[PDB]
Amino acid sequence: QSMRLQQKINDLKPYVRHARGPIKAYGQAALDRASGAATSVSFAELDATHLDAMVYIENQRNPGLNLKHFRDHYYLIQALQSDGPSAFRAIFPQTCPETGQTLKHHVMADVRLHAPTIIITEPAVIVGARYQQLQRHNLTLEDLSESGVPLSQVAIIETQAQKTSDDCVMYSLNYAIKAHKNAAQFDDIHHGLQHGTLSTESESRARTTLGALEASSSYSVMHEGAHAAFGADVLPVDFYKHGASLTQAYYLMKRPDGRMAGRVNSEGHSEAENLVQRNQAFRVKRRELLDDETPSNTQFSASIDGFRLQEIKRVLAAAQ
Ligand SMILES: CC(C)(COP(=O)(O)OP(=O)(O)OC[C@H]1O[C@@H](n2cnc3c(N)ncnc32)[C@H](O)[C@@H]1OP(=O)(O)O)[C@@H](O)C(=O)NCCC(=O)NCCS
Ligand SMILES: O=P(O)(O)O[C@H]1[C@@H](OP(=O)(O)O)[C@@H](OP(=O)(O)O)[C@@H](OP(=O)(O)O)[C@@H](OP(=O)(O)O)[C@H]1OP(=O)(O)O
């Protein structure tokens, strides 16, 4: 139990207790989730359902965010083929190549239009348990490619900040907001991608699961052309504020460039905070078995859940 997440709970509880409809049920499930109680439902589906009502209030909160929710990844392609905004971000679930069904596992795409440039951010890992995320990313990339977009101008960035299999959509959302807040660096990455290159990819692609597989297999496992890199080398510290792993926070603050060793809360704070401190401020035990107790601290940062509570408070306050 942690005072910060508890504070977030106390902030949200009235809004849910005053809510009506499916959003009350969702908010209650989120409160249970955060509090450390059991959740008799999958949160990928819940988040997927109530993503739009958020996206709206977040687009209000930060004009210029340009966040969109696409039911398919083909709707992303349809959206690309328009003289729309010069820069927009989209959240979408992957599609199973052998069934054509959407399978949760959402990702976010920071997009610039011009020969368009696409940046897919992976909250978890590129490869996956049974090489599933890999071939799914492959489907997405192939479709983007026959859409007309050159694969040398698309980049998937594995962050490995998310350690759970449930919080895809919230990580995607926070990553959208942060991609808007950190527009400059993304503009840099896009200027790079326009000429078909990615900064320090040579070192940074190895640090991903995709890198280990490409080095252990020595044959193309992900599509020829598509770029990839580890988040800590190309993204700002904002993308790791919700990393569950404290070891990750430690290893990130220990980086020589010291990009991840700064302060991670707004400067308008009496008490400063860095990555590790924030991780420790949202540090709670986790929810699996007693027979299968795990090595390393069984604990993690439930900061992302607090992000969920945050979004729900914003929506429920926005509606009333
Ligand atoms: C990343 C992964 C492959 C294992 O890498 P790993 O993190 O080296 O495995 P570890 O056993 O060392 O996990 C250690 C970290 O996981 C964190 N963790 C917290 N909740 C977790 C969870 N539900 N599942 C896995 N790891 C979790 C632990 O806190 C620890 O961080 P700490 O040492 O700071 O506490 C694995 O955790 C994972 O994400 N698997 C899912 C990937 C996948 O197939 N699909 C994802 C798409 S949803
Ligand atoms: O995710 P965002 O939409 O970008 O919201 C962020 C942020 O959230 P993150 O933890 O996900 O990075 C902080 O909230 P905390 O969880 O750290 O407490 C912050 O607040 P502080 O920096 O002062 O701590 C503030 O939230 P709020 O809107 O409630 O003020 C802020 O969004 P803003 O751009 O509105 O400041």
Curated annotation (Swiss-Prot):
Localized where? Secreted; Host cell membrane; Host cytoplasm, Host cytoskeleton; Host nucleus
The residues that the entry says bind 1D-myo-inositol hexakisphosphate are 4, 8, 61, 174, 178-181, 241-242, 266-269, 278, 310, 314
Task: PTM N6-acetyllysine: list the residues.
Answer: K241
Catalytic activity as recorded in UniProt? L-threonyl-[protein] + acetyl-CoA = O-acetyl-L-threonyl-[protein] + CoA; L-seryl-[protein] + acetyl-CoA = O-acetyl-L-seryl-[protein] + CoA; L-lysyl-[protein] + acetyl-CoA = N(6)-acetyl-L-lysyl-[protein] + CoA + H(+)
Which positions in this protein are listed as binding CoA?
105, 129, 163-164, 244-247, 283-286, 296-300
Give the positions the UniProt entry annotates as the active site. Answer: H105, E122, C168
For this protein, the record's InterPro entries field holds: YopJ-like
Q: Which GO terms describe its cellular component?
A: extracellular region; host cell cytoplasm; host cell nucleus; host cell plasma membrane; host cytoskeleton; membrane
Which cofactor does the UniProt annotation name?
1D-myo-inositol hexakisphosphate
What EC number(s) does this enzyme carry? 2.3.1.-
Record keywords, A-Z: Acetylation, Acyltransferase, Allosteric enzyme, Host cell membrane, Host cytoplasm, Host cytoskeleton, Host membrane, Host nucleus, Membrane, Plasmid, Secreted, Transferase, Virulence
Q: How is it modified after translation?
A: Autoacetylated at Lys-241; while autoacetylation at Lys-241 is required for virulence function to some extent, it is not essential.
Molecular functions (GO terms): inositol hexakisphosphate binding; O-acetyltransferase activity; toxin activity
- Cystine pairs annotated here are none
Its assembly, as annotated, is: Interacts with host plant JAZ proteins (e.g. Glycine max JAZ1 and Arabidospis thaliana TIFY10B/JAZ2, TIFY11A/JAZ5, TIFY11B/JAZ6, TIFY5A/JAZ8 and TIFY3B/JAZ12) and triggers their degradation. Binds directly to SZE1 and SZE2 at the host plasma membrane; this interaction with a complex made of, at least, SZE1, BKN2/SZE2, ZAR1 and ZED1 triggers host immunity.
According to its UniProt entry, the function of this protein is described as: Serine/threonine-protein acetyltransferase translocated into infected cells, which impairs host microtubule network and host immunity by mediating acetylation of target proteins. Blocks secretion in host cells by mediating acetylation of host tubulin, thereby impairing host microbubule network. Impairs host cell immunity by mediating acetylation of host TIFY/JAZ transcription repressors (Arabidopsis thaliana TIFY10B/JAZ2, TIFY11A/JAZ5, TIFY11B/JAZ6, TIFY5A/JAZ8, TIFY9/JAZ10 and TIFY3B/JAZ12), thereby activating host jasmonate signaling.
Name of this protein: Serine/threonine-protein acetyltransferase HopZ1a
Annotated source species: Pseudomonas syringae pv. syringae
Q: In the record, what lineage is assigned to the organism producing the protein? A: Bacteria, Pseudomonadati, Pseudomonadota, Gammaproteobacteria, Pseudomonadales
